[PDB]
Amino acid sequence: SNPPPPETSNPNKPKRQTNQLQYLLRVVLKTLWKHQFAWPFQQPVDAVKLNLPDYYKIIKTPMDMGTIKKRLENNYYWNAQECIQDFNTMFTNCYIYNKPGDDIVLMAEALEKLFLQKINELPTEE
């Protein structure tokens, strides 16, 4: 079976809204989410559907943009670094699991190049 997805709401975890988190939702996530290659990354890796019985024996910290979108829209995060780390983990998971040269890796690398551009433009905290 698939594991439960990463949590997106937890009453015990404090949260805030900042201009950097709003930029991560309206600019960074929005740019990647609408990209032609977004869709393998728009929901948790479905190892059952994809017939990957080893995926969740290898990847300890799965992450995907559907999870990140909900985390931002429902204020799961305290700071922008947590969200940036989620994006970074999503990319490195892809590079750990897949063969170099697989199409999913080329897709990840195109999204990552855009992510890096957008994050360098992160606004000073207001």
Ligand SMILES: Cc1cc(-c2ccc3nc(C4CCOCC4)n(CCOC(F)(F)F)c3c2)cn(C)c1=O
């Ligand atoms: C290992 C891994 C896999 C994927 C990933 C995620 C979702 C995917 N949905 C499909 C197809 C399956 C058949 O029904 C139509 C959709 N593929 C297969 C085609 O993917 C491709 F287009 F990219 F080639 C999916 C693959 C996502 N990350 C992050 C992975 O590491």
